[PDB]
Amino acid sequence: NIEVLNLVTGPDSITTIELYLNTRMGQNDESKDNYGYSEKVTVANSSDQDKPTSGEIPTYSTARINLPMLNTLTMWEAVSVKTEVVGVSSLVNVHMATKRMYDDKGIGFPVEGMNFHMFAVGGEPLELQFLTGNYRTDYSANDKLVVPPIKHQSTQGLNPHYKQKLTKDGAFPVECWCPDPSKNENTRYYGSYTGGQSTPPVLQFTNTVTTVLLDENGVGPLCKGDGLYVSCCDIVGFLVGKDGDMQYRGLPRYFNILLRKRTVR
Amino acid sequence: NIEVLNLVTGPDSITTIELYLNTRMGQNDESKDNYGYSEKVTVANSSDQDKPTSGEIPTYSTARINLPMLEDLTSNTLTMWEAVSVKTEVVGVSSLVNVHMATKRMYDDKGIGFPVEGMNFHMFAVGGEPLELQFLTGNYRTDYSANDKLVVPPIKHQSTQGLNPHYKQKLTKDGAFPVECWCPDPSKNENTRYYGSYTGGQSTPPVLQFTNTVTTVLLDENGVGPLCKGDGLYVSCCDIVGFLVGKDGDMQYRGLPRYFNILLRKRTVRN
Amino acid sequence: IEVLNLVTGPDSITTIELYLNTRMGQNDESKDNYGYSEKVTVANSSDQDKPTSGEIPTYSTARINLPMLNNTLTMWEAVSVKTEVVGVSSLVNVHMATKRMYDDKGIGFPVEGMNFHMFAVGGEPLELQFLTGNYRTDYSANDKLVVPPIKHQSTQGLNPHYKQKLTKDGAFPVECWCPDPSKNENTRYYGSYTGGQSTPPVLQFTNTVTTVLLDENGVGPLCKGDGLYVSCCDIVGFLVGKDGDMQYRGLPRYFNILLRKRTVRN
Amino acid sequence: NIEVLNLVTGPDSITTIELYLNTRMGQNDESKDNYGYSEKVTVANSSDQDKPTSGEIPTYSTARINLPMLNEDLTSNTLTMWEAVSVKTEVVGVSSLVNVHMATKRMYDDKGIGFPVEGMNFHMFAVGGEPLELQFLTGNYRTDYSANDKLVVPPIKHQSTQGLNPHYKQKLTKDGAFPVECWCPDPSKNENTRYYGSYTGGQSTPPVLQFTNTVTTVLLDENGVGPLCKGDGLYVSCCDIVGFLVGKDGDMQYRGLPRYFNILLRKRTVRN
Amino acid sequence: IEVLNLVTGPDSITTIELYLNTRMGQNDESKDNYGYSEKVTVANSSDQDKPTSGEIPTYSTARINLPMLTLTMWEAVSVKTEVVGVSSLVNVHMATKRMYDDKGIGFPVEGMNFHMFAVGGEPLELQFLTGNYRTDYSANDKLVVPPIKHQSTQGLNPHYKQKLTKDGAFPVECWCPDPSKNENTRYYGSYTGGQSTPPVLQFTNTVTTVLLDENGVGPLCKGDGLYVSCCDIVGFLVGKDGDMQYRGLPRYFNILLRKRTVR
Ligand SMILES: [Cl-]
Ligand SMILES: [Mg+2]
């Protein structure tokens, strides 16, 4: 829709945005115990009685950042991002109150199992597609979650009638919303999933890696209304309590985004 | 062999095709429960009584897309659409972040439900004609007759546990060709690019990625992409991400959809 | 061979396309269990280690006759190869008569465990070195296998007195023959092994990868007597029967080899 | 903050710093048994009674190295600083893990190998022109560090520290004192440090390690500028956990290895 | 050594080809258990940790005499190296523990992998570092170990060094490359641990490893000697009763050298 023209050169043609997003694993109140974890996971008796408890399901983190006001028009173009998962070293901890190895003599189980890492940087809200492992999942224990008002069998595949935009932090469940690959022309997203039961988390952290956000035409996300949208989720595994009760553990993500002025029609 | 000449230049010389294919794990009716999963897996008592139930077998997804028409067949040259590149992603990976479904669970019924896990199989193909298939099976005696909508050879022979070039097909129907007995024919498919991976074992962690930033070049070593015969683009895939483990241990394949964004350009060829 | 200039122009290039079926031990395409070994057995002791007939994988190999060409002569020079394992999707099968997960309610065990993948392209037979995990292994249950006529302790390491050439399909056991790194000047070989008991097979297939066969001097394998030699082995794991009996499973390999005419001195 | 100008050329415009850092797994006294290991790991009865024993928790290794002294003044138009260009770093003693006869739990009904050191791996190093800047973040905000008053931890605890609370920061200024479990590199700072880290978790996971003397890590940033050494100090930090030793009765200790560094530095003119 | 120009022309190049057999503990090609260690034993306590004779792997090493030659020295430019006999691990019928209630495959050789090689113009320089400072090596007086033991050797104590001057004698468990020296050697190593871990191995004759440093200079062969060192552990053989032995494989080397003028 936007006809892109030349870069604006010279002084004040560049700016940087720095932020972090804290994890939204389910206990999302920084004043309460278990912050940065989910509530204890529960398991449906049957697929038609699959009703997660309030706070046991991870959601996307997201923010809109206001950019410096500008005026053809000029827009901020996101060129690149340096992003890191924060607190990886916190997983070097095997003395927490957990199940333990070797007949109660060995280490406590570290946080381990399923990893899920995604981030997105764009010039408008991340566009979502609904897709679930169980179309019958009942989200009514927590009315602050944003989910479709109707359920249908077809949502176990891609039904393009079920879409959304990621416009609220800590509200859109990761289990039923993914990036919409048919849209997001003005957003870059990257994600990975490593599953299984007790799988080793495999994580890296460095301040030396720059991710280029320019597309194949050399154009980055263009920030509509001078808003920059950043979204993520970083699940690093489960904490296994003494009795076998399990909670998701998430970590924060840091972003340093470089933007430049771009003339558009 | 098509003799390739120059690229056609100018504003109308490029087009893009966008589509998705839903998974064909065995329950392939979007109006019914268990859509995007297989029916429960069953296990043969013996190799001569190996008869999968209807709906327990994954099949390839496929579509033919009609491209913009390009009419003179009496000239020295013709124009064809050439597929240059594709951006393709597995959709709904985040749906696997779910451990509260009605499943077997960890740690003496106190821990998480088992996530979808185990065997992964991922393949896609983009070509200017149907994907050409070779028959090869783990069990030549497999009996597919519980589901007469599957496309399989009418005769069975011991040699089909290896490569018998008398047993070939083309992928011409969505949700009908079992992945277990049909693979890409490497002796053909000159006008298709295919990429596949398999990670097996029992409860193996799925390892998946999704991004809208990766472009797969479809040009061959001579700089020529698939040429779309009869202005048809053929897209095929399969994306198994593991098994759902029910409370009693019963298991079903789980598949995910795949998205494709294909860039094509006009190419002059000799007629 | 003293190598001279490339021959240019029309008909200076040719391609050879073939497949090799796996030689896991049941190597008769008319019989049940083709593409698998016979059931694996285990030695009572290292001094009585006698594999049953058909339980041991062997190399696949072929010599392909090239177009006749022939002071100087012309030889075919192998430039590159596109090679793929065929039938990987056949491993998406968990309903065969196998051991199964979760108290006989879950999937059948897929083919899983040890993987071994190697291919070689050369202008003469692949040169082999003998090396075994057990110098005492007794191969006499199958007199069609090619093994050294005498055994010695030292063959658990590299004893250069024990060599061979891969001249017969389905006959040289992989367990005791490997490529001889001190020879094979006119062959390129590539291999990998992933072991363990029930290890996930990790496999790829594509028609988009070209392997260059030219050496560091820009010279490919030169085909002596207009013969191209192709060898491989592709073990993708074990099939686990209901009672725990196991068989190797192998898959075929496809090859598309590009060759060019090269002038050499006679 | 520092405006970088041209490289200084000529004699003594280059210098190299070579050092090693020994691991700080918890038994950090080279004269005592169990050096290079933690004390035995213990497990909290509950999250509000989570008090690691003295010596059971790994800390960062760190040193400040004096560089050849340069002029510092407020009057001169330019100054010279040392710029770290590159580092060659390796984990030392990887082959020490080829040992399965130590007094450990063993495989196959007491007939097989002793368990090798295995499990959790954590590897990080940093090279900078000032102390590594740390962010506090913990798996348990209530962790009680009072069994060892030599550890540097925040004096106040709060629920928010299970995420990123930017009010809780520090600088890595003491060897063997900052727990890895609650301090990580602060990504919002460290403009003048390069750091690299990895974690591989799980219970008995195979350690996967490499060692070579052939790899040079470039420390220049995207603008071609390396860490600039304030007060002619070079700061080197690391941690290298290679797993756990499993005693006969199942008691477990962290095992760490030393890290070697060879850092090349050059003189850089900066605006004063 | 002040390095000057390359010598050009015919006979300015030579190649050295060799293999080294593994030194897993039984190192005599005429005797039982060749190419394996003796059975692994386990210390009752850390102060009674005394490996049996032959149960511990050592480095393989050789010094190769080069053609006799300001002065001229041989400079090692590159090496092609491969582990030999990888296919020997495709064997599950040996007398071993077996899967599935005595019906399944014999356990393949599996577990710990350790692979290192070094090429240099002088002996590989070693640093002592051990998991247990008290380890008692006196069951085998042919091993080269320090004469004194000290607590500090569980870390890096630079007072404990050596040079790899004898094949089949320096235990891998207590000697590693000294990163503070070895300016005239290139070394590469990896370790994959755990209990029953799958060996992951490759072999090809198509890979050349460049030995030149960042200044374009390869190892310079002092006294016309080329030093080659390695170790290649591919796992453990698990006997019927659970007794385990290290298994090693040989390594092949093809080294290209060129004449270099030096002051
Ligand atoms: Cl100065
Ligand atoms: Mg040095």
**Domain limits for position B244:** 1-271
SS3 content of chain D, % helix, strand, coil (to 5): 5, 40, 55
Burial of D184 (0-12, 13-18, 19+ CB in 10 A): buried
Neighbours of ion ligand 1 (CB under 5 A): D 80
- Long-range CB contacts (< 8 A, 24+ apart) of E156-162? E156/D20, E156/D22, E156/D92, E156/D93, E156/D258, E156/E127, E156/E129, E157/D30, E157/E128, E158/D20, E158/E127, E160/E127, E160/E128, E161/E125, E161/E126, E161/E127, E161/E128, E162/E125, E162/E126, E162/E128
The number of the ligand nearest the C-alpha atom of D13 reads: 1
Task: Report the Cα E86 to chain-centroid distance in Å.
Answer: 16
Q: Are C93 and B42 an interchain contact pair (Cβ–Cβ within 8 Å)?
A: no
Nearest listed ligand to the Cα of residue D213: 2
Q: Which residues of E touch C235 (CB under 8 A)?
A: 90
Q: Is there a contact between B32 and B239 (Cβ–Cβ < 8 Å)?
A: no
Select from D249, D245, D194 the least CA-distant residue to D221. Answer: D194
Chain C residues in contact with B104 (beta carbon < 8 A): 102
- Sign of the C-alpha dihedral, residues E203, E206, E211, E214? negative
For chain C, the straight-line distance linking the first and the last C-alpha, in angstroms and rounded, comes to 8
Distance from C-alpha of C144 to C-alpha of C41, rounded to nearest angstrom: 19
Q: Which two tokens stand for residue A64?
A: 């809109």
Residues of C whose CB is below 8 A from B193: 206-208
Q: How far apart are CA E119 and CA E99, in angstroms?
A: 41
How far apart CA E237 and CA E242 sit, in angstroms, is 9
**Which of C59, C147, C197 to substitute to test the interface with E, most E CBs within 10 Å?**
C197
Residues of chain A with Cβ-Cβ distance to D200 below 8 Å are: 200-203
Residues annotated within the binding site of C are: 17, 182
Q: Is the dihedral of CA D46, D48, D53, D58 positive or negative?
A: positive
Query: Kindly report the CA angle at B91 between B85 and B93, in degrees rounded to 5?
Result: 130
- Sequence-separated (6 or more) residues with CB below 8 Å from residue B17: B65, B67, B233, B260, B261, B262, B264
Which chains neighbour E (Cβ–Cβ under 8 Å, 3 or more pairs)? C, D
Which distant-in-sequence residues (6+ apart) come within 8 Å of D168 by Cβ?
D135, D136, D154, D161
* Annotated binding-site residue? B187: yes
Q: Which of B96, B112, B203 sits opposite A193 (nearest CB)?
A: B96
**Residue C232 φ then ψ, to 5°:** -165, 170
Is there a contact between B115 and A114 if contact means CB atoms under 8 Å apart?
yes
Q: What is the DSSP string of E217-228?
A: ---B-GGGEEEE
Sign of CA dihedral E187, E193, E196, E200: negative
D71's CB contacts (< 8 A; 6+ apart) are: D79, D80
Reduced 3-state DSSP string for B215-267: CEECCCCCCCCCECHHHEEEEEEEEEEEEEECCCCCEEEEECCEEEEEEEEEE
Q: Kindly report the nearest CA distance between residue A157 and chain D, in angstroms.
A: 33
State in Å: Cα D225 to ligand 2 middle.
25
Which residue is closest to C59 within chain E, CA to CA?
Answer: E87
Which residues in chain A are closer than 8 Å to B208, comparing Cβ atoms? 192-194
Residue (of E38, E35, E173) closest to D99 by Cα position: E173
B115 CB-contact burial (10 Å; exposed 0-12 / middle 13-18 / buried 19+)? buried
- Tokens encoding C92: 């998406």
3-class secondary structure, D265: strand
Residue E175 to residue D211, Cβ atoms within 8 A: no
Q: Is A210:A80 a contact under the CB 8 Å cutoff?
A: yes
Cβ-Cβ contacts under 8 Å for D75 (sequence gap 6 or more): none
Q: Residue D36 has which token pair?
A: 């290079």
Asked whether the beta carbons of D24 and D58 are under 8 A apart, the reply is yes
- Residue D18 marked as a ligand binder: yes
Tell me which residue in A113, A177, A191 faces B211 most closely, judged by beta carbons: A191
Regarding chains D and B, contact by 3 or more CB pairs under 8 A is answered as no
Task: Count CA atoms within 13 Å of residue D155 on its CB side.
Answer: 0
Spatial distance between the Cα atoms of E149 and E154, rounded to a whole number of angstroms:
10
- E201/C181 touch (CB, cutoff 8 Å), yes or no: no
Q: For residue E71, what are the CA distances in angstroms to E12, E257, E263? A: 14, 16, 6
Residue labelled with tokens 């959709």 = B91
CA of D71 to the centre of ligand 1 (A): 7
> What was the elucidation method?
X-ray
Q: What is d(CA A108, CA E154) in angstroms, rounded to the nearest whole number?
A: 25
User: Which one, of D125, D93, D62, D20, lies nearest residue D255 by Cα?
Assistant: D93
Residues of chain B contacting residue A176, judged by C-beta atoms under 8 Å apart = 95
Residue D166, classed as helix, strand or coil, is coil
Smallest CA–CA separation between A49 and chain D, in Å? 32
Q: Give DSSP secondary structure letters for C145-206.
A: S---SS--GGGGS--TT-EEE--STTTSBTTTEEE-TTS-TTEEEEEEEE-SSSPPPEEEEE
Q: Helical H runs in chain C?
A: none
Contact E186/D214, CB-based, under 8 Å? Answer: yes
- Among residues E105, B160, B138, B43, which one has the least CA distance to residue C39? E105
Q: Tell me how far CA of residue D228 lies from CA of A180, B2, D78, D190, in angstroms.
A: 44, 61, 14, 12
- In whole angstroms, how far apart are CA B105 and each of B100, B116, B249, C229? 9, 12, 10, 53
Tally the domains of chain A: 1
* CATH code: domain of residue C97: 2.60.175.10
* Closest chain E CA to residue D19: E180
Nearest-by-Cβ selection for C96 from B138, B179, B198: B138
Q: In b/e form, how buried is each residue of B187-206, taking b as 16+ CB within 10 angstroms?
A: bbbebbbbbbebbbbbbbbb
CB B238 within 8 A of CB B60: yes
Q: Given an 8 Å threshold on Cβ–Cβ distance, is E40 in contact with D100?
A: yes
What's the Cα-to-Cα distance from A68 to each of A9, A75, A122, B239, D88, rounded to whole Å? 16, 10, 16, 44, 42
CB distance B144 to B156 below 8 Å: no
Nearest to E205 among C42, C160, C181 (CB): C181
Measured in angstroms, the CA of A71 and the nearest CA of chain B are apart by 30
Contact: E173, D96; criterion CB under 8 Å: yes
Name which of A43, A179, A199 is nearest B113 (Cβ-Cβ): A43
What values do phi and psi take at A94, rounded to 5?
-130, 25
Distance from CA of B204 to the nearest CA of A (A): 6
Q: Do A191 and B93 touch (CB under 8 A)?
A: yes
Nearest to E199 among C156, C178, C195 (CB): C195
- Subunits adjacent to chain B (3 or more Cβ pairs under 8 Å): A, C
